[PDB]
């Protein structure tokens, strides 16, 4: 009781110093796709590759391939 009580207090204390605010690599990558360019067929292909990448857990071998393809596109 004291364990999950106190650590749920800790994780609730911890959200009052810095709001996350800054977008994660993915959200930043989506706005990077949207701002510069694009031709719209390449834009929809890039958004489909991004939505394919977002479903994945980090550390996959083909996550490296999708991330490299996207930052070569952007």
């Amino acid at each position: 009781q004291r364990e999950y009580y106190l650590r749920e207090q800790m994780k609730a204390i911890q959200k009052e110093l810095g709001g996350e605010d800054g977008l994660s690599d993915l959200e930043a990558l989506r706005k990077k796709i949207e701002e510069v360019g694009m031709p719209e067929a390449v834009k929809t292909k890039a958004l489909k590759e991004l939505d394919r990448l977002e479903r994945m857990q980090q550390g996959s071998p083909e996550a490296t391939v999708a991330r490299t393809y996207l930052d070569w596109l952007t």
Partner: protein
């Protein structure tokens, strides 16, 4: 005048109109009490931290002290002697001649004079509502039953400064870093900022209590 000794303090300061028995069971401080009784009969108390053994460290001694007078000399063998005290105001031994042992020659009174009563009225209204909102928070009534219709009837600056900070339980470092400044309203703005920190603690822990109970029923 003559040789005025120095008697150290506990973590608990004595202010004007504070009736509290002093615990001098210290083996190098009773001779200082005897020198003080032969030294125009007043106890010199400068702010120290907690009771330690007979070796005065020089950094707990800072620039400000309080005055205590000797009114009841009742020989109690327990080491605690109930002394009614009275400080007219707060001052210290100023100039410091090095020991050993702890004895220094200071001189004449150091104070502030009350100017600008209008800001004193605005400040006393603010601290008025500020203490009566925080008496609704916790258990610290701390007053024996002889004041049941006269708790509202004095509006002097120094006494209210040495009651609102006094009955409030703080960390002691704050409680003795309020002492060293000797201007009118800076001390009272410090009290305002510190209990503003306090009410922010109140809103902070009630807000995270709200969020943790929604976390519990959400989970």
């Amino acid at each position: 005048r003559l040789e005025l000794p120095v008697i150290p303090l506990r973590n608990t300061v004595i202010l004007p109109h504070t009736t509290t028995p002093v615990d001098v069971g210290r083996a190098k401080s009773k001779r200082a009490v005897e020198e003080a009784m032969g030294a125009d009969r007043l106890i010199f108390l400068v702010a120290q931290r907690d009771p330690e053994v007979d070796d005065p460290a020089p950094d707990d001694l800072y620039t400000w002290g309080v005055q205590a007078v000797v009114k009841q000399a009742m020989r109690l063998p327990d080491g605690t002697l109930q002394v009614m005290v009275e400080a007219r105001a707060r001052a210290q031994v100023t100039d410091y001649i090095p020991g050993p042992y702890l004895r220094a020659r200071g001189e004449v009174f150091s104070e502030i004079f009350p100017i600008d009563e209008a800001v004193v009225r605005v400040l006393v209204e603010e601290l008025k509502e500020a203490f009566e909102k925080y008496v609704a928070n916790h258990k610290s009534l701390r007053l024996d039953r002889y004041q049941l219709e006269a708790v509202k009837g004095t509006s002097d600056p120094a006494m209210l400064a040495d009651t609102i900070a006094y009955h409030a339980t703080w960390t002691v470092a704050e409680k003795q870093e309020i002492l060293e400044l000797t201007d009118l309203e800076a001390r009272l703005k410090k009290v305002l900022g510190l209990l503003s920190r306090d009410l922010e603690r109140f809103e902070l822990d009630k807000r995270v209590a709200q969020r943790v109970k929604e976390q519990m029923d959400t989970n």
